[PDB]
Amino acid sequence: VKKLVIRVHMSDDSSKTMMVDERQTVRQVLDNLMDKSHCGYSLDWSLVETVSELQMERIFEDHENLVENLLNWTRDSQNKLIFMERIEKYALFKNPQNYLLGKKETAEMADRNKEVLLEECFCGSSVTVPEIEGVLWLKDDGKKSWKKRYFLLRASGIYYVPKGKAKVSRDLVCFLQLDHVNVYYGQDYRNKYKAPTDYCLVLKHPQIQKKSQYIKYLCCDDVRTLHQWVNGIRIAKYGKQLYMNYQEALK
């Protein structure tokens, strides 16, 4: 089993090398990062990749084979790995009442009922995602201009209406199937793409590493809409496996 030394940027901009092997999940790699750094355990420690050509980043899911993802990088990639606490990773699981009923409206829930609610959504014969709908900005292909379109998340991918800026259901066409796209956060898209706000998500194939028309750029009204959409997209991509990651992480 092949070994690889990766370089990881820590929370204070310093960097460390460490050996990983081709069988390891991100979870296993993070467990090592935690041991060697003496940072103390927590389900919120995360491994984050930047895609340098495209100024965006994602938190890997813990079940993912690290080495396999890294092979997607170009030979001369300036992508970085970053080891930092990210609350975004398990927010959804800590407070599911805020994502799985929506109800953008934010609220408490008793622990035991959080538990029931995740069981209902993730543990049946299939994942029962509640659908996310709302207007969002879509960057024009290869241009720094945006347009409001209405969006709808089904278990079968993202859909949208290409005509106008309103909810017209019969005119929902495939916007993007999720099987072979990861979802990222864009960094400072306000400036780089003249985004209407900074609350931006990006969908692309793992293998695309530079400018491409097949990269989809979305901008949200506020940080809540951003969170709901990213979590929703994550459920519909990864399903019950997200739940298993959380259960496993929560030592």
Side-chain angles (χ1 to χ4, degrees):
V1 272
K2 305 137 128 213
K3 310 284 153 181
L4 173 82
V5 194
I6 63 168
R7 192 160 78 95
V8 184
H9 299 77
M10 313 303 266
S11 332
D12 58 353
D13 217 348
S14 72
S15 80
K16 274 163 189 170
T17 55
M18 75 153 349
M19 191 181 69
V20 301
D21 74 42
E22 72 183 310
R23 286 177 67 91
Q24 283 176 319
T25 65
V26 166
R27 164 51 48 207
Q28 282 169 295
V29 163
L30 285 169
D31 291 346
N32 288 343
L33 281 161
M34 298 186 282
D35 302 329
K36 287 291 176 70
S37 61
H38 319 297
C39 67
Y41 207 85
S42 164
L43 81 169
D44 289 318
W45 290 102
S46 299
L47 198 66
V48 177
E49 72 180 336
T50 68
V51 181
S52 198
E53 262 295 290
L54 291 173
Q55 211 179 285
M56 61 181 84
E57 68 172 33
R58 66 174 195 106
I59 304 149
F60 287 112
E61 315 300 332
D62 288 341
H63 70 107
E64 292 192 75
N65 189 288
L66 184 53
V67 167
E68 146 192 315
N69 278 296
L70 291 191
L71 297 179
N72 291 327
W73 286 16
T74 56
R75 309 196 147 77
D76 57 346
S77 199
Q78 317 195 56
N79 291 352
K80 299 183 173 173
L81 256 26
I82 315 186
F83 173 69
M84 54 189 315
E85 270 160 304
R86 297 292 295 256
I87 68 181
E88 295 109 337
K89 183 172 68 177
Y90 293 124
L92 153 83
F93 286 85
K94 305 197 200 152
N95 292 299
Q97 78 284 9
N98 291 320
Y99 303 81
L100 311 175
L101 340 148
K103 252 49 74 59
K104 198 148 175 278
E105 239 293 353
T106 178
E108 295 315 318
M109 184 187 256
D111 281 337
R112 285 167 73 73
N113 294 337
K114 275 158 188 187
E115 225 197 348
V116 166
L117 181 65
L118 305 160
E119 277 158 14
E120 290 182 340
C121 153
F122 289 106
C123 299
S125 46
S126 87
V127 171
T128 50
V129 209
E131 319 197 302
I132 320 301
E133 105 250 43
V135 175
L136 290 172
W137 308 88
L138 174 66
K139 194 178 97 61
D140 289 309
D141 288 348
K143 285 201 278 182
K144 290 187 189 158
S145 43
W146 305 69
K147 295 197 188 188
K148 275 178 127 33
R149 309 282 186 205
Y150 176 84
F151 281 93
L152 195 138
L153 176 78
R154 292 192 183 105
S156 56
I158 306 182
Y159 293 80
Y160 82 138
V161 188
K163 217 309 293 290
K165 60 196 168 169
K167 174 194 139 193
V168 181
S169 299
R170 76 163 160 301
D171 274 339
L172 286 161
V173 307
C174 180
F175 171 79
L176 205 60
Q177 295 206 11
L178 291 176
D179 306 85
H180 309 290
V181 303
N182 293 334
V183 59
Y184 308 69
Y185 298 106
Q187 294 322 304
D188 189 40
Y189 275 13
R190 255 295 224 183
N191 294 313
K192 173 158 204 51
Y193 290 113
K194 304 323 195 197
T197 93
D198 259 333
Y199 315 111
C200 289
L201 65 154
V202 181
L203 309 145
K204 66 155 200 71
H205 192 290
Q207 293 194 259
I208 286 166
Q209 291 292 310
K210 53 170 188 150
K211 297 273 184 286
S212 188
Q213 61 186 168
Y214 310 123
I215 303 169
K216 299 295 186 200
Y217 301 81
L218 297 169
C219 183
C220 302
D221 276 336
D222 58 43
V223 81
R224 197 68 182 87
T225 315
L226 178 61
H227 289 158
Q228 285 175 210
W229 274 102
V230 176
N231 284 294
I233 297 169
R234 285 169 73 231
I235 296 170
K237 182 165 173 80
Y238 296 110
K240 164 161 182 195
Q241 179 67 260
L242 284 185
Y243 189 48
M244 303 180 58
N245 292 351
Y246 173 71
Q247 295 267 132
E248 191 172 332
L250 195 57
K251 263 194 276 150

mmCIF file of all heavy atoms in Angstrom, residues 196-238:
data_model
loop_
_atom_site.group_PDB
_atom_site.id
_atom_site.type_symbol
_atom_site.label_atom_id
_atom_site.label_comp_id
_atom_site.label_asym_id
_atom_site.label_seq_id
_atom_site.Cartn_x
_atom_site.Cartn_y
_atom_site.Cartn_z
ATOM 1 N N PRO A 196 -23.117 39.627 -6.447
ATOM 2 C CA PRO A 196 -23.995 40.530 -5.690
ATOM 3 C C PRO A 196 -23.834 40.439 -4.173
ATOM 4 O O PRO A 196 -24.139 41.403 -3.484
ATOM 5 C CB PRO A 196 -25.408 40.106 -6.116
ATOM 6 C CG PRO A 196 -25.238 38.743 -6.685
ATOM 7 C CD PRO A 196 -23.883 38.724 -7.313
ATOM 8 N N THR A 197 -23.384 39.298 -3.657
ATOM 9 C CA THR A 197 -22.927 39.200 -2.256
ATOM 10 C C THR A 197 -21.748 38.243 -2.136
ATOM 11 O O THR A 197 -21.340 37.617 -3.120
ATOM 12 C CB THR A 197 -24.011 38.669 -1.286
ATOM 13 O OG1 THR A 197 -23.869 37.245 -1.158
ATOM 14 C CG2 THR A 197 -25.458 39.063 -1.732
ATOM 15 N N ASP A 198 -21.235 38.098 -0.917
ATOM 16 C CA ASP A 198 -20.201 37.118 -0.644
ATOM 17 C C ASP A 198 -20.677 35.682 -0.334
ATOM 18 O O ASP A 198 -19.856 34.756 -0.190
ATOM 19 C CB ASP A 198 -19.277 37.620 0.453
ATOM 20 C CG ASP A 198 -17.971 38.167 -0.103
ATOM 21 O OD1 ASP A 198 -17.544 37.729 -1.215
ATOM 22 O OD2 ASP A 198 -17.379 39.040 0.583
ATOM 23 N N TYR A 199 -21.985 35.487 -0.235
ATOM 24 C CA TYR A 199 -22.499 34.159 0.099
ATOM 25 C C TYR A 199 -22.647 33.276 -1.159
ATOM 26 O O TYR A 199 -23.733 33.145 -1.728
ATOM 27 C CB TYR A 199 -23.772 34.280 0.930
ATOM 28 C CG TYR A 199 -23.624 35.307 2.015
ATOM 29 C CD1 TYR A 199 -24.334 36.512 1.979
ATOM 30 C CD2 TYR A 199 -22.746 35.089 3.080
ATOM 31 C CE1 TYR A 199 -24.186 37.459 2.986
ATOM 32 C CE2 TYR A 199 -22.589 36.026 4.091
ATOM 33 C CZ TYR A 199 -23.307 37.209 4.043
ATOM 34 O OH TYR A 199 -23.124 38.127 5.072
ATOM 35 N N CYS A 200 -21.520 32.699 -1.577
ATOM 36 C CA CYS A 200 -21.405 31.978 -2.841
ATOM 37 C C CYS A 200 -21.042 30.505 -2.702
ATOM 38 O O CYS A 200 -20.104 30.144 -1.976
ATOM 39 C CB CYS A 200 -20.353 32.637 -3.729
ATOM 40 S SG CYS A 200 -20.809 34.234 -4.417
ATOM 41 N N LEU A 201 -21.763 29.664 -3.441
ATOM 42 C CA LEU A 201 -21.402 28.244 -3.588
ATOM 43 C C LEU A 201 -21.059 27.880 -5.055
ATOM 44 O O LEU A 201 -21.551 28.515 -5.991
ATOM 45 C CB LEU A 201 -22.508 27.349 -3.050
ATOM 46 C CG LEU A 201 -23.863 27.374 -3.769
ATOM 47 C CD1 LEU A 201 -24.565 26.038 -3.539
ATOM 48 C CD2 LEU A 201 -24.741 28.511 -3.290
ATOM 49 N N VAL A 202 -20.213 26.866 -5.237
ATOM 50 C CA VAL A 202 -19.700 26.499 -6.544
ATOM 51 C C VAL A 202 -19.848 25.001 -6.659
ATOM 52 O O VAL A 202 -19.538 24.264 -5.717
ATOM 53 C CB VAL A 202 -18.199 26.872 -6.738
ATOM 54 C CG1 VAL A 202 -17.701 26.495 -8.131
ATOM 55 C CG2 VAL A 202 -17.941 28.352 -6.515
ATOM 56 N N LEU A 203 -20.356 24.563 -7.812
ATOM 57 C CA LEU A 203 -20.481 23.138 -8.141
ATOM 58 C C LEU A 203 -19.613 22.833 -9.360
ATOM 59 O O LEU A 203 -19.692 23.518 -10.379
ATOM 60 C CB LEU A 203 -21.934 22.777 -8.399
ATOM 61 C CG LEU A 203 -22.923 23.204 -7.324
ATOM 62 C CD1 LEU A 203 -24.219 23.584 -7.989
ATOM 63 C CD2 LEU A 203 -23.178 22.080 -6.349
ATOM 64 N N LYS A 204 -18.726 21.856 -9.208
ATOM 65 C CA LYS A 204 -17.898 21.368 -10.318
ATOM 66 C C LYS A 204 -17.468 19.932 -10.097
ATOM 67 O O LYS A 204 -17.389 19.464 -8.962
ATOM 68 C CB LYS A 204 -16.646 22.233 -10.546
ATOM 69 C CG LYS A 204 -15.633 22.199 -9.407
ATOM 70 C CD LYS A 204 -14.231 22.533 -9.909
ATOM 71 C CE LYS A 204 -13.177 22.033 -8.923
ATOM 72 N NZ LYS A 204 -13.113 20.549 -8.963
ATOM 73 N N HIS A 205 -17.204 19.255 -11.209
ATOM 74 C CA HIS A 205 -16.553 17.961 -11.228
ATOM 75 C C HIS A 205 -15.234 18.025 -10.486
ATOM 76 O O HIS A 205 -14.480 18.989 -10.637
ATOM 77 C CB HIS A 205 -16.336 17.520 -12.677
ATOM 78 C CG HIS A 205 -15.928 16.076 -12.819
ATOM 79 N ND1 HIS A 205 -14.714 15.621 -12.437
ATOM 80 C CD2 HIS A 205 -16.621 14.979 -13.315
ATOM 81 C CE1 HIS A 205 -14.641 14.299 -12.663
ATOM 82 N NE2 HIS A 205 -15.807 13.912 -13.209
ATOM 83 N N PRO A 206 -14.938 16.994 -9.674
ATOM 84 C CA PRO A 206 -13.662 16.929 -8.967
ATOM 85 C C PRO A 206 -12.446 17.131 -9.882
ATOM 86 O O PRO A 206 -11.460 17.706 -9.444
ATOM 87 C CB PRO A 206 -13.651 15.500 -8.371
ATOM 88 C CG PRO A 206 -15.081 15.128 -8.239
ATOM 89 C CD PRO A 206 -15.808 15.834 -9.366
ATOM 90 N N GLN A 207 -12.512 16.671 -11.133
ATOM 91 C CA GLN A 207 -11.348 16.691 -12.038
ATOM 92 C C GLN A 207 -11.031 18.027 -12.707
ATOM 93 O O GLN A 207 -9.939 18.194 -13.246
ATOM 94 C CB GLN A 207 -11.451 15.583 -13.100
ATOM 95 C CG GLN A 207 -11.354 14.194 -12.478
ATOM 96 C CD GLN A 207 -11.123 13.086 -13.478
ATOM 97 O OE1 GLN A 207 -12.051 12.384 -13.847
ATOM 98 N NE2 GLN A 207 -9.878 12.913 -13.912
ATOM 99 N N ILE A 208 -11.977 18.960 -12.697
ATOM 100 C CA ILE A 208 -11.742 20.277 -13.270
ATOM 101 C C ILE A 208 -10.973 21.132 -12.264
ATOM 102 O O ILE A 208 -11.348 21.231 -11.099
ATOM 103 C CB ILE A 208 -13.055 20.939 -13.695
ATOM 104 C CG1 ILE A 208 -13.566 20.261 -14.957
ATOM 105 C CG2 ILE A 208 -12.874 22.430 -13.886
ATOM 106 C CD1 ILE A 208 -15.002 20.591 -15.297
ATOM 107 N N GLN A 209 -9.882 21.730 -12.729
ATOM 108 C CA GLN A 209 -8.930 22.390 -11.845
ATOM 109 C C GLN A 209 -8.602 23.811 -12.290
ATOM 110 O O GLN A 209 -7.864 24.507 -11.607
ATOM 111 C CB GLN A 209 -7.643 21.557 -11.730
ATOM 112 C CG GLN A 209 -7.815 20.244 -10.977
ATOM 113 C CD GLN A 209 -8.091 20.462 -9.497
ATOM 114 O OE1 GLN A 209 -7.375 21.220 -8.825
ATOM 115 N NE2 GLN A 209 -9.152 19.826 -8.987
ATOM 116 N N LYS A 210 -9.143 24.232 -13.427
ATOM 117 C CA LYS A 210 -8.954 25.594 -13.934
ATOM 118 C C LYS A 210 -10.250 26.097 -14.569
ATOM 119 O O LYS A 210 -11.289 25.439 -14.448
ATOM 120 C CB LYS A 210 -7.774 25.677 -14.924
ATOM 121 C CG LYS A 210 -7.849 24.690 -16.070
ATOM 122 C CD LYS A 210 -6.808 24.956 -17.146
ATOM 123 C CE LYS A 210 -7.061 24.049 -18.353
ATOM 124 N NZ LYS A 210 -6.626 24.652 -19.650
ATOM 125 N N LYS A 211 -10.184 27.254 -15.236
ATOM 126 C CA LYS A 211 -11.385 27.949 -15.703
ATOM 127 C C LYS A 211 -12.156 27.057 -16.657
ATOM 128 O O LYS A 211 -11.591 26.487 -17.597
ATOM 129 C CB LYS A 211 -11.060 29.290 -16.385
ATOM 130 C CG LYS A 211 -10.391 30.341 -15.497
ATOM 131 C CD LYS A 211 -11.384 31.206 -14.712
ATOM 132 C CE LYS A 211 -10.674 32.299 -13.914
ATOM 133 N NZ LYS A 211 -9.955 31.777 -12.710
ATOM 134 N N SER A 212 -13.446 26.923 -16.403
ATOM 135 C CA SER A 212 -14.280 26.099 -17.247
ATOM 136 C C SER A 212 -15.703 26.614 -17.166
ATOM 137 O O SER A 212 -16.170 27.035 -16.089
ATOM 138 C CB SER A 212 -14.188 24.603 -16.847
ATOM 139 O OG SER A 212 -14.862 23.761 -17.774
ATOM 140 N N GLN A 213 -16.360 26.588 -18.321
ATOM 141 C CA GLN A 213 -17.771 26.941 -18.470
ATOM 142 C C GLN A 213 -18.726 25.954 -17.752
ATOM 143 O O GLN A 213 -19.895 26.287 -17.524
ATOM 144 C CB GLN A 213 -18.128 27.057 -19.975
ATOM 145 C CG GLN A 213 -17.919 25.751 -20.757
ATOM 146 C CD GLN A 213 -18.128 25.838 -22.271
ATOM 147 O OE1 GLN A 213 -17.778 24.913 -22.990
ATOM 148 N NE2 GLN A 213 -18.695 26.936 -22.750
ATOM 149 N N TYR A 214 -18.219 24.761 -17.414
ATOM 150 C CA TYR A 214 -18.985 23.689 -16.745
ATOM 151 C C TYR A 214 -18.960 23.816 -15.218
ATOM 152 O O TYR A 214 -19.546 23.011 -14.491
ATOM 153 C CB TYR A 214 -18.469 22.307 -17.161
ATOM 154 C CG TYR A 214 -18.338 22.117 -18.648
ATOM 155 C CD1 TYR A 214 -17.120 21.769 -19.215
ATOM 156 C CD2 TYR A 214 -19.432 22.297 -19.493
ATOM 157 C CE1 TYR A 214 -16.981 21.590 -20.580
ATOM 158 C CE2 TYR A 214 -19.303 22.124 -20.860
ATOM 159 C CZ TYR A 214 -18.069 21.771 -21.396
ATOM 160 O OH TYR A 214 -17.934 21.611 -22.760
ATOM 161 N N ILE A 215 -18.244 24.821 -14.740
ATOM 162 C CA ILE A 215 -18.289 25.202 -13.353
ATOM 163 C C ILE A 215 -19.540 26.066 -13.201
ATOM 164 O O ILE A 215 -19.745 26.973 -13.991
ATOM 165 C CB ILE A 215 -17.023 26.001 -12.963
ATOM 166 C CG1 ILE A 215 -15.744 25.182 -13.271
ATOM 167 C CG2 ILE A 215 -17.088 26.386 -11.508
ATOM 168 C CD1 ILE A 215 -14.427 25.935 -13.170
ATOM 169 N N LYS A 216 -20.369 25.760 -12.202
ATOM 170 C CA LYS A 216 -21.571 26.532 -11.908
ATOM 171 C C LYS A 216 -21.362 27.402 -10.672
ATOM 172 O O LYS A 216 -20.911 26.913 -9.626
ATOM 173 C CB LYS A 216 -22.741 25.589 -11.672
ATOM 174 C CG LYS A 216 -23.076 24.717 -12.863
ATOM 175 C CD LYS A 216 -23.559 25.578 -14.011
ATOM 176 C CE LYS A 216 -24.054 24.758 -15.187
ATOM 177 N NZ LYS A 216 -24.049 25.607 -16.405
ATOM 178 N N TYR A 217 -21.695 28.689 -10.797
ATOM 179 C CA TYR A 217 -21.536 29.643 -9.698
ATOM 180 C C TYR A 217 -22.861 30.184 -9.200
ATOM 181 O O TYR A 217 -23.641 30.719 -9.979
ATOM 182 C CB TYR A 217 -20.681 30.811 -10.140
ATOM 183 C CG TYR A 217 -19.303 30.434 -10.597
ATOM 184 C CD1 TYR A 217 -19.074 29.948 -11.885
ATOM 185 C CD2 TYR A 217 -18.233 30.591 -9.759
ATOM 186 C CE1 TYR A 217 -17.798 29.623 -12.315
ATOM 187 C CE2 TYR A 217 -16.957 30.278 -10.170
ATOM 188 C CZ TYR A 217 -16.743 29.788 -11.445
ATOM 189 O OH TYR A 217 -15.465 29.478 -11.808
ATOM 190 N N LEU A 218 -23.103 30.060 -7.902
ATOM 191 C CA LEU A 218 -24.358 30.507 -7.310
ATOM 192 C C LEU A 218 -24.106 31.501 -6.174
ATOM 193 O O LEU A 218 -23.146 31.349 -5.408
ATOM 194 C CB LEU A 218 -25.159 29.316 -6.798
ATOM 195 C CG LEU A 218 -25.611 28.321 -7.855
ATOM 196 C CD1 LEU A 218 -26.172 27.036 -7.245
ATOM 197 C CD2 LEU A 218 -26.620 28.975 -8.779
ATOM 198 N N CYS A 219 -24.962 32.512 -6.073
ATOM 199 C CA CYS A 219 -24.849 33.532 -5.030
ATOM 200 C C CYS A 219 -26.153 33.635 -4.249
ATOM 201 O O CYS A 219 -27.238 33.698 -4.838
ATOM 202 C CB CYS A 219 -24.491 34.893 -5.628
ATOM 203 S SG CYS A 219 -24.256 36.191 -4.399
ATOM 204 N N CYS A 220 -26.041 33.662 -2.927
ATOM 205 C CA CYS A 220 -27.208 33.649 -2.079
ATOM 206 C C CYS A 220 -27.408 35.014 -1.453
ATOM 207 O O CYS A 220 -26.451 35.796 -1.349
ATOM 208 C CB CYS A 220 -27.047 32.595 -1.000
ATOM 209 S SG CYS A 220 -26.774 30.943 -1.661
ATOM 210 N N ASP A 221 -28.645 35.278 -1.021
ATOM 211 C CA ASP A 221 -29.014 36.561 -0.408
ATOM 212 C C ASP A 221 -28.266 36.845 0.891
ATOM 213 O O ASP A 221 -27.933 37.999 1.170
ATOM 214 C CB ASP A 221 -30.534 36.649 -0.140
ATOM 215 C CG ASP A 221 -31.328 37.104 -1.362
ATOM 216 O OD1 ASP A 221 -30.747 37.770 -2.255
ATOM 217 O OD2 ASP A 221 -32.545 36.789 -1.430
ATOM 218 N N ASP A 222 -28.011 35.785 1.665
ATOM 219 C CA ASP A 222 -27.513 35.895 3.036
ATOM 220 C C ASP A 222 -26.895 34.566 3.493
ATOM 221 O O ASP A 222 -26.892 33.590 2.737
ATOM 222 C CB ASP A 222 -28.630 36.381 3.979
ATOM 223 C CG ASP A 222 -29.845 35.473 3.967
ATOM 224 O OD1 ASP A 222 -29.679 34.242 3.978
ATOM 225 O OD2 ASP A 222 -30.978 35.984 3.957
ATOM 226 N N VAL A 223 -26.369 34.513 4.712
ATOM 227 C CA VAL A 223 -25.519 33.375 5.108
ATOM 228 C C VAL A 223 -26.359 32.134 5.433
ATOM 229 O O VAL A 223 -25.883 30.985 5.327
ATOM 230 C CB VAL A 223 -24.527 33.762 6.237
ATOM 231 C CG1 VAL A 223 -25.193 33.742 7.604
ATOM 232 C CG2 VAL A 223 -23.297 32.873 6.214
ATOM 233 N N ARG A 224 -27.613 32.388 5.797
ATOM 234 C CA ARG A 224 -28.601 31.361 6.062
ATOM 235 C C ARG A 224 -28.940 30.572 4.794
ATOM 236 O O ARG A 224 -28.874 29.340 4.777
ATOM 237 C CB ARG A 224 -29.860 32.024 6.648
ATOM 238 C CG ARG A 224 -30.838 31.095 7.345
ATOM 239 C CD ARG A 224 -30.276 30.520 8.643
ATOM 240 N NE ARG A 224 -31.231 29.585 9.249
ATOM 241 C CZ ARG A 224 -31.304 28.284 8.965
ATOM 242 N NH1 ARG A 224 -30.471 27.726 8.089
ATOM 243 N NH2 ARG A 224 -32.223 27.535 9.566
ATOM 244 N N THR A 225 -29.303 31.286 3.733
ATOM 245 C CA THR A 225 -29.629 30.656 2.441
ATOM 246 C C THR A 225 -28.426 29.846 1.951
ATOM 247 O O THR A 225 -28.580 28.716 1.495
ATOM 248 C CB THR A 225 -30.021 31.698 1.362
ATOM 249 O OG1 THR A 225 -30.930 32.652 1.920
ATOM 250 C CG2 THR A 225 -30.684 31.026 0.157
ATOM 251 N N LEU A 226 -27.239 30.429 2.062
ATOM 252 C CA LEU A 226 -26.015 29.719 1.753
ATOM 253 C C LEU A 226 -25.916 28.396 2.521
ATOM 254 O O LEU A 226 -25.655 27.351 1.917
ATOM 255 C CB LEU A 226 -24.784 30.602 1.991
ATOM 256 C CG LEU A 226 -23.400 29.992 1.765
ATOM 257 C CD1 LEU A 226 -23.209 29.522 0.322
ATOM 258 C CD2 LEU A 226 -22.294 30.965 2.175
ATOM 259 N N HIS A 227 -26.178 28.428 3.830
ATOM 260 C CA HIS A 227 -26.069 27.226 4.660
ATOM 261 C C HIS A 227 -27.094 26.180 4.340
ATOM 262 O O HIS A 227 -26.768 24.978 4.237
ATOM 263 C CB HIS A 227 -26.046 27.569 6.147
ATOM 264 C CG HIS A 227 -24.753 28.231 6.597
ATOM 265 N ND1 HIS A 227 -24.667 28.986 7.715
ATOM 266 C CD2 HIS A 227 -23.488 28.262 6.008
ATOM 267 C CE1 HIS A 227 -23.415 29.457 7.843
ATOM 268 N NE2 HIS A 227 -22.694 29.010 6.797
ATOM 269 N N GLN A 228 -28.332 26.603 4.141
ATOM 270 C CA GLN A 228 -29.383 25.663 3.782
ATOM 271 C C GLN A 228 -29.064 24.954 2.459
ATOM 272 O O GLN A 228 -29.139 23.723 2.364
ATOM 273 C CB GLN A 228 -30.736 26.374 3.752
ATOM 274 C CG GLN A 228 -31.279 26.675 5.149
ATOM 275 C CD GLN A 228 -32.579 27.491 5.166
ATOM 276 O OE1 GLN A 228 -32.827 28.238 6.108
ATOM 277 N NE2 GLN A 228 -33.411 27.343 4.140
ATOM 278 N N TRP A 229 -28.659 25.728 1.454
ATOM 279 C CA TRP A 229 -28.367 25.164 0.132
ATOM 280 C C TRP A 229 -27.218 24.188 0.089
ATOM 281 O O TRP A 229 -27.344 23.090 -0.493
ATOM 282 C CB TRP A 229 -28.195 26.260 -0.914
ATOM 283 C CG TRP A 229 -29.513 26.693 -1.514
ATOM 284 C CD1 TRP A 229 -30.247 27.828 -1.218
ATOM 285 C CD2 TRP A 229 -30.298 25.987 -2.520
ATOM 286 N NE1 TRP A 229 -31.383 27.879 -1.965
ATOM 287 C CE2 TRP A 229 -31.483 26.805 -2.758
ATOM 288 C CE3 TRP A 229 -30.139 24.805 -3.231
ATOM 289 C CZ2 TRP A 229 -32.463 26.435 -3.661
ATOM 290 C CZ3 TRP A 229 -31.136 24.445 -4.149
ATOM 291 C CH2 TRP A 229 -32.268 25.247 -4.358
ATOM 292 N N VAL A 230 -26.092 24.578 0.681
ATOM 293 C CA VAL A 230 -24.927 23.708 0.836
ATOM 294 C C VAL A 230 -25.283 22.445 1.627
ATOM 295 O O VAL A 230 -24.967 21.342 1.189
ATOM 296 C CB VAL A 230 -23.741 24.450 1.492
ATOM 297 C CG1 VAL A 230 -22.571 23.504 1.742
ATOM 298 C CG2 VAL A 230 -23.285 25.606 0.629
ATOM 299 N N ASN A 231 -25.962 22.574 2.763
ATOM 300 C CA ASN A 231 -26.313 21.359 3.488
ATOM 301 C C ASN A 231 -27.251 20.457 2.694
ATOM 302 O O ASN A 231 -27.030 19.220 2.591
ATOM 303 C CB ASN A 231 -26.816 21.662 4.896
ATOM 304 C CG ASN A 231 -25.668 22.027 5.835
ATOM 305 O OD1 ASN A 231 -24.823 21.188 6.139
ATOM 306 N ND2 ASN A 231 -25.615 23.285 6.273
ATOM 307 N N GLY A 232 -28.260 21.078 2.093
ATOM 308 C CA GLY A 232 -29.210 20.351 1.266
ATOM 309 C C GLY A 232 -28.460 19.597 0.191
ATOM 310 O O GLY A 232 -28.569 18.384 0.087
ATOM 311 N N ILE A 233 -27.676 20.323 -0.600
ATOM 312 C CA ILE A 233 -26.873 19.703 -1.655
ATOM 313 C C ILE A 233 -26.048 18.535 -1.135
ATOM 314 O O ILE A 233 -25.995 17.478 -1.773
ATOM 315 C CB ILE A 233 -26.023 20.745 -2.411
ATOM 316 C CG1 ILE A 233 -26.973 21.732 -3.097
ATOM 317 C CG2 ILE A 233 -25.106 20.081 -3.450
ATOM 318 C CD1 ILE A 233 -26.289 22.955 -3.658
ATOM 319 N N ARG A 234 -25.458 18.701 0.040
ATOM 320 C CA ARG A 234 -24.647 17.652 0.658
ATOM 321 C C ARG A 234 -25.456 16.392 0.987
ATOM 322 O O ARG A 234 -25.018 15.269 0.690
ATOM 323 C CB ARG A 234 -23.921 18.190 1.890
ATOM 324 C CG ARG A 234 -22.725 19.075 1.544
ATOM 325 C CD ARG A 234 -22.184 19.807 2.757
ATOM 326 N NE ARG A 234 -21.466 18.893 3.637
ATOM 327 C CZ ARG A 234 -21.667 18.772 4.939
ATOM 328 N NH1 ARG A 234 -22.580 19.524 5.549
ATOM 329 N NH2 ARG A 234 -20.939 17.897 5.627
ATOM 330 N N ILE A 235 -26.641 16.576 1.565
ATOM 331 C CA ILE A 235 -27.536 15.445 1.847
ATOM 332 C C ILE A 235 -27.849 14.661 0.578
ATOM 333 O O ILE A 235 -27.620 13.461 0.509
ATOM 334 C CB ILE A 235 -28.838 15.895 2.520
ATOM 335 C CG1 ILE A 235 -28.497 16.503 3.879
ATOM 336 C CG2 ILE A 235 -29.808 14.715 2.630
ATOM 337 C CD1 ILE A 235 -29.652 17.200 4.561
ATOM 338 N N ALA A 236 -28.336 15.374 -0.427
ATOM 339 C CA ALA A 236 -28.713 14.788 -1.712
ATOM 340 C C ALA A 236 -27.536 14.136 -2.455
ATOM 341 O O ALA A 236 -27.745 13.222 -3.253
ATOM 342 C CB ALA A 236 -29.337 15.863 -2.582
ATOM 343 N N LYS A 237 -26.308 14.617 -2.207
ATOM 344 C CA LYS A 237 -25.121 13.964 -2.774
ATOM 345 C C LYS A 237 -24.676 12.727 -1.990
ATOM 346 O O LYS A 237 -24.478 11.651 -2.576
ATOM 347 C CB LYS A 237 -23.932 14.918 -2.900
ATOM 348 C CG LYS A 237 -22.723 14.234 -3.534
ATOM 349 C CD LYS A 237 -21.682 15.214 -3.997
ATOM 350 C CE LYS A 237 -20.438 14.486 -4.460
ATOM 351 N NZ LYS A 237 -20.534 13.918 -5.830
ATOM 352 N N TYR A 238 -24.493 12.907 -0.682
ATOM 353 C CA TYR A 238 -23.866 11.914 0.163
ATOM 354 C C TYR A 238 -24.827 11.033 0.934
ATOM 355 O O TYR A 238 -24.452 9.943 1.354
ATOM 356 C CB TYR A 238 -22.894 12.588 1.113
ATOM 357 C CG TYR A 238 -21.738 13.269 0.398
ATOM 358 C CD1 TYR A 238 -21.647 14.664 0.358
ATOM 359 C CD2 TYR A 238 -20.733 12.518 -0.233
ATOM 360 C CE1 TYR A 238 -20.623 15.298 -0.304
ATOM 361 C CE2 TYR A 238 -19.679 13.138 -0.890
ATOM 362 C CZ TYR A 238 -19.638 14.531 -0.923
ATOM 363 O OH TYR A 238 -18.623 15.156 -1.563
#
